[PDB]
Design a protein around this ligand. Structure first.
Ligand code: ATP
Ligand code: ADP
Ligand code: MG
Ligand code: MG
Lengths: 685, 704
């Protein structure tokens, strides 16, 4: 098997499936590794059946192992982060391939999603910023330089690939990006000025082309992300707020669950991206609020029609690579048929953004006519053994079928030839189809947000020039849905005159909920959707900081005081007058004298020098003295009556938080409580 | 009104009112009317319409049916599949609780179908595994006990009474099915179980005495029988479970110890990750079950400890041969239900070939338990012989069109295959092949009782060989048992932290006795106090599973229950603040504690005003030592608590120390300072902030 060895030499570290007869067979060391990973029988030869190759590949991709498929040439390389096929891919989640580079100046980062074609680059300078980017992106595959100095960040990620220095060279990168984009200058894209990002991008493009083994028609643009453009949240802040996953790792009880009712899969993925990155620019937000208001009345008619369209973004990418299935094309014909009705309903409503969206969608009538002649309504799964081309598209194919094994073979050859030509006719308009899919996806997200607003009484928010937040009748999006009992509503007022509020309250009195609600409303205003309150006035916000969830991590090697203290440090170092900080009790883990001393100091610094908008929850009642000392801090108290909880914020400072009464509600035995009351009376005495 | 074919669909739908029906027409499975609309939303499929007396139609192809079924099962939706015999009958119902097919199932996880029945006397519960054949019964009288049992079992599908009072426990669970009261009947249940297990009385099983359990079990067996649509040969026994037999762990305790999943829901950094590297899938699941339930009886543990010692030398030879056997338990269940694919029969031939070599290595080793495991496994040479003649080494995936039968298993099939090689002959060859495949199922069925026993032994051997290899690599030692409850540990190391820490791990000894039941542990922050308390619990659970333990020598007294109160969390859904979640856990310990139990408590009184927290802790400690009299480890940062041992009998103070550089050594005495500000500086708090904090602490102490 010298031929296997020579091909293996080309790809030494990647498992190779060699197609012999009807099976793909690994050999030698690869067979041993495969038998352990896929539980196959190690006869050294290990075999995978041709029909179920996708199922096995899915297991290897989850593991992170690259596979090379050989039909002799290697047609393609399948890797985590570079997969276009439906079975490996996830309906409501996306795969990102990333490259990281380190220079003396700083870090360079690039991310490409193969199916959407979205290419983004950035240059994080601090070590901390790179970590936050790595977490939000969650790249499936990371390509890194051999000399990377800090390998602490890269080791956790799955599918790491080590890269040689020559690939990251800047001069080759500028030339390569220019050829694919087709622009002599990257100045129009805006990526020409920053060298480190371009180096990472050149490597990513080179690797992607190598794995795909074909031209990439879909990628036509590159973009740069900057800190001024979006609100910044550290990974700890993101997890505590539970935007897409709860603290225990589950889908339910999340802001996404309340707001995601989208009919199409592409809408769902897009909503999550919008939720993760709040957009600071007021102009895009104003257009979004207006489109939502216009379509609120017509939402019911549009939701059934949109569902039929389905996800087209993925289908277009498969068409670009010429791997599209017969079923994929048929789903597209159905989507085109839905486009005329959508346009008619959209024409009646009159608003400038909505009309533009209607124009972007298009009708593509000529293409639909071609598909209706070209494809049968029920399509056989395999083109290789299928009657996918319908009768009447081609006179010759019909003649061969009527003549009907030479006739069958000729017909089969003709059918495949016609199928390939079909890709060619559809290719000239591929940019137009790609533009439409983006427009339809935006519509689904916007219609869904409108329906939710009507059902749950949401209200549009108003932006202001100075940074401040004012709310009337505020209701938490998640807790209100969960509690059967009526959710009491709490107002909020924050201004440069009153930046900080110290919330002191009885246990189980609603203090944590009030703080989580304020942050969640601000994230919603900046995604441009409606806010659950009677009136919202919101200023500019650069960053959101949350210190609400307490845990100690063994993998981190950190105790609970340590995890809490690390988070306080990030806030003190990176806070800005624009950012909003909400924090829970400080020094809970350690002894009382130390905890009070540390908390008084952190609060004084945040009010006096950082000047950020802040909400502070304290069980230490000495801290209520601090608002008197410093301007810009005020006291607000949640209230409860004995025990029954009012759940309503009032001005003033709470005293005598009750723990023993809460313990009785918990079920602690009465005799234990009786001794405790006696002990407490002694301690106070 | 409707067309005649449409009428036939309507009649079948009438039989099954609330479950989606896949009607197979031509090469596609089609759903109609309301079913089509629901399927299109759930399976993301098109909703075309065909016109007859405006019919909604949704279609899925035959090849992708398996992929589609998986999506519905994970969702929790039952599907009924109908194939035309002309008349059509529902061949099977696929439901979340019972799955026999490989794709829907997970290799290292198992599916439990459960029934809960409620009566004034007490709750009744039963659980059935469709693949293992394991049937278990229970009667947990307390509401708390039922909830903990439900969490450990985690049933995929739960069947409940229409009038069940405690709907909340049922709420929050996937797959709930409401059931009519007539099915949960005691007199009928006794008759049904007796027919299935072949016993006139249930006394031998020991389930005859329990009335509530019998009713729940009767509903489960009947439901399983209908969904499958065939006799279930594999279930052969029902076993009562009792509180005395196994150590009892509350649901919060299992999460804090992180035996199989971490606080954030991930496999990494768990005791199972450190202790599990088992070659076979069946072994991995068995170890997880053993880890969840620790066996109180000393005699079973002693047989296990001996086996681990005997095979430590021979583990390297045994590990490769075991991997080749792989999973046979699941393959056996499919053979019993007659749903097995041609590949599964070929996989079986491979495992039988591995049994002879394994026996030779085992024979030389001379230990009484080891010899017993070897005899149970058997060789099964005859089964291997017929399988080898029957199947080609490479087997085509589909029986319907296949060369799966090898030449010579049947002379007649060979004659047809040759004639076809030389449609009518090909069809006859295919028809004969299907008949032969069914006959092969019949030949293997009589030996099913033996094969099931063999599979259990191989799974047991694999857990044991893996435990022995791990013991040599990480230097584990066997523990010893004493009649009076007590804990004696020398040079103990936490299993998980030591593996993940690059630096060397300091080792700490421990002594707990009836004379000194409660130890109060006080130390500086980042000083190792929490790791030590977790270390004691993990060694105890490992001793009771019979594995070697990570310490130089361990002496252990009997323990009825383990209580863990560590970690801080709040549940927005259950509407409890952190202080309440902690207090609910403390209340469970005070109410259910016994002298034999072990209590580990971490920082009780956090999350509330200091005076209140201290008072609650003083009372909880005093009550536990004076009345409950259980072994207690109490981590704390309140230094008033250290004065208590002088006041009461059985209480001692032990302190971890650090000079900040952390020594990490446990020594007798009480530690005065927690050193919080210095730990903050290590974290990265800005120096100016630390300097202000130091000034404040000095001011507070000076005033006092
Ligand atoms: N015996 C030991 N040898 C080496 N390292 C140890 C030892 N004990 C603990 N450590 C390390 O020290 C760290 C202390 O963790 P742990 O959470 O137990 O401290 P702690 O006392 O709980 O701190 P805090 O009270 O501030 O939460 C752990 O991450 C562990 O890795
Ligand atoms: N405004 C409110 N109206 C109704 N229920 C509320 C309100 N605020 C909080 N709750 C409920 O009270 C519980 C306790 O509030 P929480 O803030 O968690 O306690 P704590 O203030 O001690 O942190 C929450 O789980 C929530 O379900
Ligand atoms: Mg809270
Ligand atoms: Mg701790």
């Amino acid at each position: 098997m010298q031929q296997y060895l020579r091909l293996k030499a080309q790809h030494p570290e990647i498992l190779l499936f060699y197609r012999m007869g009807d099976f793909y067979e690994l050999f030698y060391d690869d067979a041993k590794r495969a038998s352990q990973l896929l539980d196959i029988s190690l006869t050294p030869m290990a075999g995978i059946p041709y029909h179920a190759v996708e199922n096995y590949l899915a297991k290897l991709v989850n593991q992170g192992e690259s596979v090379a498929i050989c039909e002799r040439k290697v047609v393609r390389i399948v890797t985590p982060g570079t997969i276009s096929d439906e079975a490996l891919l996830q309906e409501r989640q996306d795969n990102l391939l990333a490259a990281i580079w380190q220079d003396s100046k700083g870090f360079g980062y690039a991310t490409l999603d193969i199916s959407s074609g979205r290419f983004r680059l950035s240059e994080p300078a601090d070590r901390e910023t790179m970590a936050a980017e790595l977490q939000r992106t969650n790249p499936a595959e990371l390509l890194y330089a051999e000399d990377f100095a800090e390998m602490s960040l890269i080791e956790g990620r799955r599918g790491l690939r080590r890269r040689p220095l020559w690939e990251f060279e800047i001069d080759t990168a500028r030339q390569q990006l220019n050829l694919q984009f087709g622009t002599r200058d990257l100045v129009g894209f805006g990526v020409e000025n920053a060298p480190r990002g371009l180096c990472a991008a050149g490597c990513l493009l080179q690797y992607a082309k190598d794995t795909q083994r074909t031209t990439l028609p879909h990628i036509r643009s590159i973009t740069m992300e900057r800190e001024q453009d979006s609100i910044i949240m550290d990974a700890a802040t993101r997890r505590n707020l539970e935007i897409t996953q709860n603290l225990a790792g589950g889908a339910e009880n999340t802001l996404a669950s309340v707001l995601d009712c989208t009919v199409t899969p592409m809408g769902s993925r897009m909503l999550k991206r919008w939720l993760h990155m709040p957009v600071r620019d007021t102009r895009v937000l104003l257009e979004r609020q207006q489109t939502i208001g216009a379509l609120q009345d017509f939402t019911a008619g549009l939701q059934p029609v949109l569902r039929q369209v389905g996800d087209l973004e993925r289908i277009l990418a498969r068409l670009a690579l010429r791997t599209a299935r017969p079923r994929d094309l048929a789903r597209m014909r159905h989507a085109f048929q839905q486009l005329p009705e959508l346009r008619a309903q959209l024409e009646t409503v009159d608003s400038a953004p909505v009309q533009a969206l209607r124009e972007k969608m298009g009708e593509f009538a000529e293409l639909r006519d071609l598909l209706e002649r070209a494809i049968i309504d029920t399509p056989p799964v395999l083109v290789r053994d299928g009657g996918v081309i319908a009768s009447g598209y081609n006179e010759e194919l019909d003649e061969w079928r009527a003549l009907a094994l030479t006739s069958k073979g000729k017909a089969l050859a003709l059918e495949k030839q016609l199928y390939e030509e079909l890709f060619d006719l559809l290719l000239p308009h591929l940019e137009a189809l790609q533009q439409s899919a983006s427009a339809l996806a935006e519509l689904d997200v916007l219609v869904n947000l409108a329906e939710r607003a009507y059902t749950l009484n949401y209200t549009c928010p108003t932006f202001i020039d100075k940074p401040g937040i004012r709310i009337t009748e505020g209701r938490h999006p998640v807790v209100e849905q969960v509690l059967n009992e009526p959710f009491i509503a709490n107002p909020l007022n924050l201004s440069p005159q009153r930046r900080m509020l110290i919330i002191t309250g009885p246990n189980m009195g609603g203090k944590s909920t009030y703080m989580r609600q304020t942050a969640l409303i601000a994230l919603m205003a900046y995604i441009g959707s409606y806010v659950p309150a009677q009136k919202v006035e919101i200023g500019p916000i650069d960053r959101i900081f949350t210190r609400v969830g307490a845990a100690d991590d063994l993998a981190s090697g950190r105790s609970t005081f340590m995890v809490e203290m690390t988070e306080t440090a990030n806030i003190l170092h990176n806070a800005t007058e624009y950012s909003l900080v909400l924090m829970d009790e400080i020094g809970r883990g350690t002894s009382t004298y130390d905890g009070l001393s540390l908390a008084w100091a952190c609060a004084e610094n945040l009010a006096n020098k950082i000047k950020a908008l802040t909400l502070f929850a304290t069980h230490y009642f000495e801290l209520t003295q601090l608002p008197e000392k410093m301007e810009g801090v005020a006291n607000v108290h949640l209230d409860a009556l004995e025990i029954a909880f009012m759940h309503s914020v009032q001005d003033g400072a709470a005293s005598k938080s009750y723990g023993l009464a809460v313990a009785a509600l918990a079920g602690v035995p009465k005799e234990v409580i009786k001794r405790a009351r006696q002990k407490l009376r002694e301690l106070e005495s």
